[PDB]
Design a protein that fits this description.
The structure is a homodimer.
Chain A (H helix, E strand, L loop, with lengths): L1 E5 L3 H12 L3 E5 L2 H10 L1 E4 L4 E4 L2 E3 L10 E4 L6 H8 L8 E5 L5 H8 L3 E15 L2 E12 L6 H9 L4 E3 L3 H22 L3 H4 L5 H18 L8 H11 L6 H7 L10 H11 L4 H18 L1
Parallel strand pairs in A: 1-2, 1-6, 2-5, 3-9, 6-7, 7-8, 9-10
Antiparallel strand pairs in A: 3-4, 8-9
Helix pairs in contact in A: 3-4, 6-8, 6-10, 6-12, 8-11, 11-12
Bound molecules: NADPH dihydro-nicotinamide-adenine-dinucleotide phosphate (2 copies).
């Protein structure tokens, strides 16, 4: 089983590197910075358990997906279309593309562009690029995938490599739950450059999160999404279990990078407007992140 | 007539400075930073028409309001109560207290604490403290005041000093119009540190402003306020007449000072909540300015 990782960043390197450690044939399609370090001394895979250098192929040409039976597509939502179109010509016709991304539109976007079988996955992991060719795993690293033609074979192969997997007939719901969590925290954290535990103690913040969340639940209902039963409590409890954590969006803005805000609060805005559902709290958070992003850019 | 300016900052020094320049006995209750500058070289009153050093009395003791017939109360809303109680025992009983402030609760707050006649005023000016003891008037400088027992005599005295004044039976609506304008621009400008003309080009910003304003207009209606007829259009046009202007709230956050946000979007939140009217856009803007302020103070 040949595996290609399109967009070998924090997520791609962990899952890709774990499969390489298990003995599969894996090639990471990464940026020159990382390709140069992977070809020099291999992929440094630093886990909460072990720390190793892993011999994997790496390339910056999206055609290196050639011959892969399974492509883990791990770019950010903002790059879904460009990355998919870059790899489309070389992609095997029988290849299974897994979307290891956050957001609710990636699988649909991929299927609109590609004839190959696509399956959405929900990624539960904490990872970062510690430097060139270096991935650092802070915690978790499991997956929930839609049903694929590979069946239980796909989950058996991941478990055998050190990444547990569960097939679900409601990946839509899991992806939306994660989206609403991100709508509640990411923009607030990014705009103020404060961690979740500091954030929730500001005056009015619990009531802002209520407003944001009720807007999202209204959109999820209109969209026929079945969310977990205690989703609101689970969201509120994140400030307690990750008190010193700042959001990915916060880290993007601190570093002058473009965030995924168009696929977080922006999605709720676009969707709410299309459905006649007021989304004012979500709209202020989206507009504010984009204004800050645009100042940094110009 | 004897006049005291309580909270001689940008507004207090301009209006007080014109009166002192016109021959009135004016005393400025300012912070020490300024008091030492005035006691040294006098108040510098720079307009786009002239530049002058004006001999005025200044002090930091709020008891200096003693024996004033007219008190111009020009502190930020955050300080109305503390400043009002500071000057309360010293204040002449027949003194007229004019609130030259922004917000819609100052005159009521003052009347709750003081027995003296209080009149709300709407301040139309652009003024800054260019440095210690130095007031820079950028434009306008007229007042619209509620009716007073002093009647037309009050407006005739101000006009004589180069300060145009009108009396209105709807200062309420004028104060609310200014509030809604500030609810639309101040927090956005402060959170992002961008001027009005840059802000309004952002993706989704016109729609945020619509949302903020509609919440404000809903609260204003439930409160029985009569606003000017084209208030929405006048607010949107500010982005084109002051394209390079950042808000007073932006300048406060840039300098690590506490803003008046509890009396801008915070008033709308508190009132909307009390009236059962959703105020989500305003609530986000208020919470965020407060979070940023709190970080700059402790952490
Ligand atoms: N990081 C985490 O712990 C979590 C992440 N997620 C989600 O998983 C997804 C990926 O996240 P993450 O790994 O952190 O993001 P990263 O940016 O770290 O990884 C993606 C990488 O793909 C690269 N890339 C984009 N286009 C191309 C291209 N055409 N050719 C080659 N490389 C390309 C990017 O380059 P460049 O650097 O220039 O953009 C980047 O290095 C996101 O949707 C994210 O929200 C979900 C759960 C956990
Ligand atoms: N500036 C402008 O162009 C205009 C302002 N306004 C409104 O008018 C009001 C006044 O604003 P502005 O003049 O700009 O604000 P300023 O901060 O410049 O002026 C207030 C001054 O009073 C001082 N003060 C506060 N408490 C006391 C006290 N206990 N004893 C002595 N001094 C005290 C303040 O000290 P400290 O510096 O420590 O806070 C400050 O120096 C506001 O409500 C504002 O929104 C309306 C239209 C235009």
């Amino acid at each position: 089983m040949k595996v290609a990782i399109m967009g070998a960043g924090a997520v791609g390197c962990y899952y890709g590197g774990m499969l390489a450690r298990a003995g599969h044939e894996v090639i990471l399609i990464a940026r020159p910075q990382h390709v140069q370090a992977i070809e020099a001394t291999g992929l440094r895979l630093e886990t909460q358990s072990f720390d190793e250098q892993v011999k994997v192929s790496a390339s910056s040409d999206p055609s290196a997906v050639q011959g892969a039976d399974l492509v883990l597509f791990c770019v950010k939502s903002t790059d879904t279309q460009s990355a998919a179109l870059a790899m489309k010509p070389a992609l095997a016709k029988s290849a299974l593309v897994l979307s290891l991304q956050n957001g609710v539109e990636n699988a649909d976007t991929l299927r609109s562009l590609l004839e190959q079988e696509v399956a959405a996955a929900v990624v539960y992991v904490a990872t970062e690029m510690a430097g060139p060719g270096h991935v650092r795993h802070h915690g978790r690293g499991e997956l929930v995938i839609e049903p694929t033609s590979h069946g239980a074979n796909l989950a058996a192969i991941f478990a055998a490599a050190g990444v547990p997997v569960e097939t679900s007939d409601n990946v839509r719901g899991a992806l939306w739950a994660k989206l609403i969590l991100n709508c509640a925290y990411n923009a607030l954290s990014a705009i103020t450059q404060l961690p979740y535990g500091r954030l929730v103690r500001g005056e009015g913040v619990e009531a802002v999160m209520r407003d944001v969340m009720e807007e999202c639940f209204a959109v999820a209902r209109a969209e026929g999404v079945k969310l977990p039963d205690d989703v609101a409590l689970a969201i509120r409890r994140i400030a307690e279990t990750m008190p010193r954590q700042s959001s990915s969006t916060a880290q993007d803005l601190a570093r002058g990078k473009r965030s995924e805000i168009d696929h977080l609060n922006g999605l709720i805005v676009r969707r709410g407007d299309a459905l006649g559902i007021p989304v004012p709290a979500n709209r202020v958070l989206h507009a504010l992140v984009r204004l800050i992003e645009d100042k940094q850019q110009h």
